[PDB]
Amino acid sequence: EDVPIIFNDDLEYTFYGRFKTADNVAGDTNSIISSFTVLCSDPFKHGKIQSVKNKVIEVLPYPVKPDKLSFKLLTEGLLATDGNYRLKSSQAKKGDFLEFDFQTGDTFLNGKVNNNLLDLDSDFKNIRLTTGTDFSSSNYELTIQYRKAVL
Amino acid sequence: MTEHFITLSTTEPNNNIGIVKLRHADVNSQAIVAQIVENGQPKNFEGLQPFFCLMAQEATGQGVSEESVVSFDAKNGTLKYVASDNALQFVGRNEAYFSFRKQEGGRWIEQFSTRTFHYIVEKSIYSQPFKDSNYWWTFKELYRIFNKYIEDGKKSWEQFVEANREILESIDPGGVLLAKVIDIEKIVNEKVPAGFKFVLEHDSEYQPEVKVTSYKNAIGTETDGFDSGPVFGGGTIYNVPVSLSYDRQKVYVEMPKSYTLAGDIILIDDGTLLVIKETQVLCFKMSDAKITKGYVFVA
Amino acid sequence: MTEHFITLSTTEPNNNIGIVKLRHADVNSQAIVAQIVENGQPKNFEGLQPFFCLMAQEATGQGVSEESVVSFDAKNGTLKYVASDNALQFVGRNEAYFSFRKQEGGRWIEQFSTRTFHYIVEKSIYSQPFKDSNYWWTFKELYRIFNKYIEDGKKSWEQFVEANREILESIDPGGVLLAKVIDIEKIVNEKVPAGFKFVLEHDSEYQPEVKVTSYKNAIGTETDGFDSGPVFGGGTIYNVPVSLSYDRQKVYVEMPKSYTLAGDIILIDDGTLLVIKETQVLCFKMSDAKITKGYVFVA
Amino acid sequence: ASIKKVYRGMKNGAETINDDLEAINSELTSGGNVVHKTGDETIAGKKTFTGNVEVNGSLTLPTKSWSGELGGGIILSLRKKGTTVEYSIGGEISSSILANSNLVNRSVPNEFCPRNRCSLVGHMVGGWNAFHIDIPSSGVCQWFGPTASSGTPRGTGTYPIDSA
Amino acid sequence: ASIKKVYRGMKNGAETINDDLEAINSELTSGGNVVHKTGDETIAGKKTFTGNVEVNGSLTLPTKSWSGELGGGIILSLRKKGTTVEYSIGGEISSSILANSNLVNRSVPNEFCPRNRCSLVGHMVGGWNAFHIDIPSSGVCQWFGPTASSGTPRGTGTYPIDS
Amino acid sequence: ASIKKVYRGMKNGAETINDDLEAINSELTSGGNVVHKTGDETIAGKKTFTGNVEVNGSLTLPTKSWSGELGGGIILSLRKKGTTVEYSIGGEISSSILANSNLVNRSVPNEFCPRNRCSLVGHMVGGWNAFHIDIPSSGVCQWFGPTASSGTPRGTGTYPIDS
Structure with missing residues (x-):
């Protein structure tokens, strides 16, 4: 499986790769010097995990796919928008009920796991965060969770 | 721009x-x-x-x-x-x-x-x-x-007094005027706000009214514990004459010299501050704002 | 944090x-x-x-x-x-x-x-x-x-004033008198309602309460125009100690000599009157009655 | 907004200026006599819109409903909405209704009455037969089919309420 | 509102600040470029209402009236109100009107013309006979009854102006 | 408007007072949360007009279009505008349509469906024949003419969306 790689000179970020191919190695001397490649399925290095409320205002060098979206409703239905992406959930749990949208897995309703019903047919899970992405609305309180991605 | x-x-x-x-x-x-x-x-x-x-x-x-x-x-x-x-x-x-x-x-x-x-x-x-x-x-x-200025000002003052020594010796015979002014001095130290300057920081943008009272042996201030003093509940309550002065969120409270009391500054969670030094209490009551800090004025 | x-x-x-x-x-x-x-x-x-x-x-x-x-x-x-x-x-x-x-x-x-x-x-x-x-x-x-420098400077100035007063007060049997009078007269002309008398004519048949305040650099009074002063809005507001006296539709307001201010008398629509002399303002606030005229007392 | 006077030599000038700016700024967001881009508000006066008015929610006008048997078993159902009346013809002819005769059981009330004679075209179930019923300004409806003693009259549409 | 600049070392500052505050406050109650909860006012621009618009008084739209003899004694009376045209058919057939023939005395003016062909169903007084008259976008009305040389055509309704 | 606090002993007072007066005055002409007498603006909330609302430009309501062959070659074209549906009957009868029978090719979608049964009166080209088609709240349209196997049905009008 993939492994978290961090470098001594770049300690802030974290790569996620796996050992691939090793370069030819001599069968003498008793003091060898060679190399090996580490294939990273995701070319981005990720910093620390951050939990922000509603909008991201941090200087993001690249559009970031989130890690978790913690929604808490206030009105009847859920309609999350930033201008480009529209996340919608008809017949949602109205009257202050938490809906976890874990990007690196599945969706949750309050405590129990709810995948089949949670999101509507025209909802988005391919959402990306720019330096000025705003989701703030009077209908829901969002706790956005993401990791800064750099190349 | x-x-x-x-x-x-x-x-x-x-x-x-x-x-x-x-x-x-x-x-x-x-x-x-x-x-x-x-x-x-x-x-x-x-x-x-x-x-x-x-x-x-x-x-x-x-x-x-x-x-x-x-x-x-x-x-x-x-x-x-x-x-x-x-x-x-x-x-x-x-x-x-x-x-x-x-x-x-x-x-x-x-x-x-x-x-x-x-x-x-x-x-x-x-x-x-x-x-x-x-x-x-x-x-x-x-x-x-x-x-x-200290060195030169000292030398200029000492020369001024010594030159006028002859006229300072013959100013008051015996002490008729001195006796009098000492009776005015004790009344100025008690009845007029002159000496004691206390600062109350507050939350108002305006000029809140302050009222000061002085009393001895109030509850829990007595030397030998609760109800050990001569008058239970507290002694004579004196309304302290004050001269009020205001800056943004700061009241300067000027009181007569006699009420000078440097003790423990206790802030109550409303418009009241106390200064307690053993048995003696100095009480500050603010109308329409909350005292946020209190301290003796220093320049 | x-x-x-x-x-x-x-x-x-x-x-x-x-x-x-x-x-x-x-x-x-x-x-x-x-x-x-x-x-x-x-x-x-x-x-x-x-x-x-x-x-x-x-x-x-x-x-x-x-x-x-x-x-x-x-x-x-x-x-x-x-x-x-x-x-x-x-x-x-x-x-x-x-x-x-x-x-x-x-x-x-x-x-x-x-x-x-x-x-x-x-x-x-x-x-x-x-x-x-x-x-x-x-x-x-x-x-x-x-x-x-700030701490040692304050201590050296405190030493300077006391040492100089020891020459005037402790070295002379009659010199002590001068030192007392000088201090008393300044308190009496600042804190006691002394020599400044202003008359406020009113519409009441009764004795309206008057409150007086003094301040420098208020809005529109600054020397070099609006917001040219060191403290925007005005400096320290001083509550002026008053001695009130009443005749039919006339209040005699007695204030200490230090508050003497002969300037322009401005009457506002209600129970408020100002005396403005360049940057200095003397404010008069009447409760329960309307000021009809205001002027310095002439005897 | 309710504001306080500002003047030279004023006591507490900076505070008054601020209080006034705050009182005024408050009405730029909600309340007072200003119409806002948010909130439930009641607006009095003649408001003339010279541009394009686009309604995305609902447009609600003055509404009133009425139904009655005009005569001969013919039932007229009405709903006034603004300056238009929505109608529906129903019931079944119960007795002989003479050609061009007034329907004299119930008239249309004045508030539902048109300014001019309105001809309401209808169809009789089960054949190719059409008729019309006139609603004059008096509300006394009139049958303009031929003489009829049975059948099922139908027709839904609208008619206007005013004229210049 | 028309206000004056406030600045450091300004002459007569308090008066100017007060005059500005008064000028601004005046427009919160009436006039200027703000719409108020009282008063007769004219409003320009595209106003998009995303909520519920409730009219308790009147709603007045652009209105225009027209009447004319289309042909064969048939009179059409029209009133445009907004994006809808209210019609009323009247008169009496005076001469032979052939089946599916154009009514060629007067056309409906362009401002009253629909985007598509509108079929206006009517009834002939005194019998069970129905007909229709088409109003095409050209305004050249067409009779879709059979050949007729007499009778009283009637029918009130509406048709739309856009598509 | 976004304004800054003004207070005694404040740094740069005249500037802040002026910036505030300018920020506020700006919103009396355009933007902010105030509706103006000029400009394109979006307005949220329930706006109740107690007086006379006069529209000189256009009044645009929610619109949706649909057309379908109901059955037997009869085509219904619809346009919803607010609480009203504009209809147009067309096509040509292709097969036997029995008297009082349901038209079972396509139903009217729910969003175009009335609260009550709507009787849509029409006329057949070339004769004096009239019919009607009922649109119930379910959208299953019903032919109320007699049995017919040919001909050209027409009729334009409106029906309401609620009761």
Whole structure:
């Protein structure tokens, strides 16, 4: 499986790769010097995990796919928008009920796991965060969770 | 006026911000508009004053500038700094940061700050001449001049008294006037607000009324414990005559010399402050505001 | 205050993973929040006291930098350490760890600890040495000398006034009288309602209460135009002590001599009248009646 | 907004200026006599829109309903909405209704009455037969089919309420 | 509102600040470029209402009237109101009107013309006979009854102006 | 408007007072949360007009279009505008349509469906024949003419969307 790689000179970020191919190695001397490649399925290095409320205002060098979206409703239905992406959930749990949208897995309703019903047919899970992405609305309180991605 | 919008973090490095480019001779036009961010979210710095900190060059050790920022929205975590002549002094690459401070007089309480960021000053037709820093010299000279006033002022006064000694000996025979003024002196020390100056910091933007009372042996102040004093509940209550003076969120309470009491300052969670020194209590009651801090005036 | 959340393991061989980056000048508002883990589960450290151990380069021994942590939840394996001035002194790339200990009679019994992680203190304008008055200085050095000049200067002035008064008051049997009179007369002309008498004509058949205030540099009174004064809005507001006297539709307001002010009399639509003489204002507030005329008392 | 006077030599000038700016700024967001881009508000006066008015929610006008047997078993159901009346013809012819005769059981009330004679075209179930019923301004409806003694009259549409 | 600049070292500052505050406050109650909760006012621009618009008084739209003899004694009376045209058929057939023939005395003016062909169903007084008249976008009306040389055509309704 | 606090001993007072007056005055002409007498603006909330609302430009309501072959070659074209549906009957009868039978090719979608049974009167080209088609709230349309196997049905009008 993939492994978290961090470098001594770049300690802030974290790569996620796996050992691939090793370069030819001599069968003498008793003091060898060679190399090996580490294939990273995701070319981005990720910093620390951050939990922000509603909008991201941090200087993001690249559009970031989130890690978790913690929604808490206030009105009847859920309609999350930033201008480009529209996340919608008809017949949602109205009257202050938490809906976890874990990007690196599945969706949750309050405590129990709810995948089949949670999101509507025209909802988005391919959402990306720019330096000025705003989701703030009077209908829901969002706790956005993401990791800064750099190349 | 021109503005330069940047978002600055306290946690992450500030390398991804755009190129800030200033012009050397621009006076008070070019302003850096910054959004303070902590771990991706805006930073509330309510109760803190932002400061622009320009770092000096490592070679010469000149160019350190600490300047208080005029405009800020502490709630929304934003600030506007107008480049100073000091910020524009070095033509080339500059390194700076914002520091947020809280000071109770001559000492810091809490300080946090952004990560450094860089900016560039471009060359102008004008080239400002800068004097070499002399904060120490100006200070040591003001201290010397003031100490010279002490030495010379002492010598001028002692010569004045000795020259007028002959007229000071024949001013009052026996002590008819002296006896009198000593009776006026004791009444001025008790009945007029002159000597004792106390400061009450408050939450009002206005001038709240203050009422002061003096009493001995109130509950829990007695020397030998509860109900050990001669008069249970407290002795004679004296309304203290006051002279009130106001500044923004500060009342200066002037009382007669006799009521001078330096003890433990107790703040009640409303419009009341007490000063307790053993059995003696000095009580301050504020109408229409809450006392936030109380202390004896020092100049 | 800024927080830095990290999970630290006692088992997992990290050695260098986990960077904390602080600023030198930041006082009491930078905390490291840590979750202690042993074998991937929180670590109970009940009965143990956590310690922040900083391993500063160029400042090593037997006790390099150990500081007891004030806030911890031993049960849930969490702690909060606020970076001390000591913790921030060593500007540079350092390494630190948390040690948990138990002591009996001032002797060690059990001591487990986390894996080291990095601690970096970035230089501030306050740490960086700068040139001033042809010498090299750091902020802490000058700030001490300047506050020494302020403290020793106040003490030398306090000494100056008392020593000079000892020549006038203690050296003369009649000189003491002069020293008392001079002080009394100034209090009597400032705090006592002495020699300033103003008349306020009104519409009441009764005795309306009058309140008087004095202030300099109020809105529209500044010498060099609007907002040209040192304190925007006006300086210190002084409640003027008054002696009130009444005749039919006339209030005689007696104030101390220091408040004497012959200027322009401005009547506002209600129970308010002002006397403005350049930057100085004398304000008159009437309750329960309307001021119809105002003028200085002529005898 | 309710504001306080500002003047030279004023006591507490900076505070009054601020209080006034705050009182005024408050009405730029909600309340007072200003119409806002948010909130439930009641607006009095003649408001003339010279541009394009776009309604995305609902447009609600004055509504009133009425139904009655005009005569001969013919039932008329009405709903007034603004300056238009929505109608529906129903029931079943019960007795001989003479050609061009007034329907004299119930008239249309004045509030539902048109300014001019309105001809309401209808169809009889089960054949190709059409008729009309006139609603004059008096509300006395009139049958303009031929003589009929049975059948099921139907027709839905609208008619206007005013004329210049 | 028309206000004056406030600045450091300004002459007669308090008066100017007060005059500005009064000028601004005046427009919060009536006039200027702000819409108020009282008063007769003209409003320009595209106003998009995302909520519920409730009219308790009147709603007045652009109105225009027209009447004319289309042909064969058939009179059409029209009133445009907004994007809808209210019609009324009247008169009496005076001469032979052939089946599916154009009514060629007067056309419906362009401003009353629909985007598509509108079929206006009518009834002939005194019998069970129905017909229709088409109003095409050209306004040249067409009779879709059979050939007729007499009778009284009637019918009131509406047709739309856009598509 | 976004304004800054003004207070005694304030730094740069005249500037802040002026900036505030200018920020506020700006919103009396355009933007902010106030509706103006000029400009394109979006207005949220329940706006109740107690007086006379006069529209000189256009009044645009929610619109949706649909057309379908109901059955037997009869084509119904619809346009919803607010609480009203504009209809147009077309096509040509292709097969035997029994008297009082349901038209079972396509139903009217729910969003175009009335609250009550709507009887849509029409005319057959070339004769005096009339019919009607009922649109119930379910949208299953019903032919109320007699049995017919040919001909051209027409009729334009409106029906309401609620009761």
